[PDB]
Each structure stands twice: as C-alpha cells, then as structure tokens.
Amino acid sequence: GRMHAPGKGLSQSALPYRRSVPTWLKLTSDDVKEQIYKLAKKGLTPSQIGVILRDSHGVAQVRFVTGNKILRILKSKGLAPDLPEDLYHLIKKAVAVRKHLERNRKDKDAKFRLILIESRIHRLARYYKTKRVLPPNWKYESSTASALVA
Amino acid sequence: AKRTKKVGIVGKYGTRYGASLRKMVKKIEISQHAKYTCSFCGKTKMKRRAVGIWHCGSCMKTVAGGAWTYNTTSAVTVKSAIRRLKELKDQ
C-alpha cells in the first residue's frame, strides 16, 4: 500500500492499448518538442509540462508522439535541473514543515510527520546516488536545505 | 567538547548546597542571564540590570519586568484582563 500511511487506495492512470498517434492530431513530432522547449523555459517542471499540453493540445502522451519522455528531451540539450522534480518537492515540503515547527515547538504531530518526510528524502536520495544522478557526496543537510529550494 | 552532563550553569557551586537546591537554581539562573528579544527594536539585547529592571543595549530602553525572567506569567494574565475590562462595558 501507501508508504508512510496505512491506505491501500487503487487510483492511478490507465493507459489505452493503442500506442498510436490519434488520427485527428494533425501535429508533428518536432512541433511538440519545440513547444516543450518554450514552456519549460517558463519555469515549469516535467510533471507539469505534460498536463497543460494534455488539456489544451490533445497530446495524450509525448512518448507516443516523439518516442522519448518529457524529462528525457529536456536532458538531451541541458535545460533540466540538477535536482529531480520528486526530490525537489520533498525538500520543499521538509523545509515548510520544519519552519512551522520552530514557531510551533509544542506540535507533536508536525514533529512526527517531519521524520516521515525526511526519511523519504534519504530513501529517494539513496536511489539517485546509485544511478549516478546525484553526486556520491550529496547530502540532505537541514542547515543548507532552504538553499536548494527556490 | 562535552564538559558536563547534568549540572550545566550550576557547576560553579561545586559539591555544595544540596542537589535539589542547585537543581532549583538552574532554571532561575539561565533565565536571568539570558538575552531576550526586545519588543521595541527587535534586537536580542534585553540584558538584566538590577532585580525587576530590563534594559536594551540599542535604543536604550529600560523595561520594568519580572525578577528572574522578563515576563512574569501573572503580569501577562493581568494585561490580558485589563484590556478586556477596558473594551467590556466601555466604563
């Protein structure tokens, strides 16, 4: 089930069997790439590239058009960030909880949810260090943590 | 490094005066020597003068507070009640 909560929900997206480009989509493989090159320079991360060109461009999934993933073509010419998007949002959340807990020292549940989030940071950092995504001397310290997040 | 494990500030009193009187002192003694944040200039410069007197290094403001601590909890409850009685009944 869910990792740090006792929920066993079944809700995740179900792709169709046909991997082919839809017939009505009169749009190339190159034009969706240069659109990705536009709006990823507009501060956007690859989890939210694909949702706005699903809701207003008819592109169901970029890999069915281009053949490559969204982050995989950001990374092809050097405009994807150093931190991954999932590791970024955990550190953004752990700074936010710890900033709460300084003022609210007597919150025993913000104290408990902090070490669940902070353990997900190291369970995820232990993966990207083995895949040579992060450098092997990387470390989530708390006193440098707000510097990583924008 | 790690110089003590229990006594802290009352390691200057040596073996003397009793363990439970030295433990009673070290709440008072960390509190009268602590710097407090000034409510007037925001700088943590509230040093204690004589007993009941609290003073700013910068902005030079003197405050009449508690004896061993800046706010007495009896005097915060009253200030809550005085401004409540001043907005109730409007005299």
């Binding site: - | 944040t37 409510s39 007037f40 200039c41 925001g42 700088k43 902005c59």
Partner: protein
C-alpha cells in the same frame, strides 16, 4: 489567526521574486521623494515618529502606507531574507496586485 495573512505576505514573497523593491529606512526615503515608490509597508515595531514621517511623505507623494501586522523581524522573514526590516518600498510590482488591493 487562520486564513487571511497570505493575502499580504504571499503577495510580498511574489513581488520579491518578480518585481523590484528596496529595504531599509533611508532607501524608501530616497524612493519616496523622487516618485518611484508605490506602496510602502511599515512594521508594527518601528518608532512612532518614524511611522509619522513616512505617513507624512506618502501623503505628499500620494502613495499608500500598508501597516503590516507583525514584528520588524517578522516582516524580514516575510520578505524572504535573514534581516529585520521596518520599512520597505516596492517600486515595481511584478505581476501581483498589492496596490490594486485595499490600500
């Protein structure tokens, strides 16, 4: 103490990312006397003759004074820096509506 403060200090940490700003007393005093200031924000901590002569110049420059509900050390964290600050002046809002709000 529940819902509404991130009208004014979520917009403040959005002007800080996008638009222009000056911090400190004698910088918003230059910006107020040569037209470039738009909305000066005073902390609830500043000395009460400093609060008067910024309320008096903003009447002379026809600009707004928002009275922030917090410490000058609290307005500094709300800006997003490790300071304390009584008086700021935004001299360009980035894309938000602090002037188009209540003051």
């Amino acid at each position: 103490t529940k819902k509404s403060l991130e009208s004014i200090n979520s917009r403040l940490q959005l002007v800080m990312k996008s638009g222009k700003y000056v911090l400190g007393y004698k910088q918003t005093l230059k910006m107020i006397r040569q037209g470039k200031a738009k909305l000066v924000i005073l902390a609830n901590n500043c000395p009460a003759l400093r609060k008067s002569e910024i309320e008096y110049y903003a009447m002379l420059a026809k600009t707004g004074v928002h009275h922030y509900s917090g410490n000058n050390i609290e307005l500094g964290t709300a800006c997003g820096k490790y300071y304390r600050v009584c008086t700021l002046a935004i001299i360009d809002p980035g894309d938000s509506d602090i002037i188009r709000s209540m003051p």
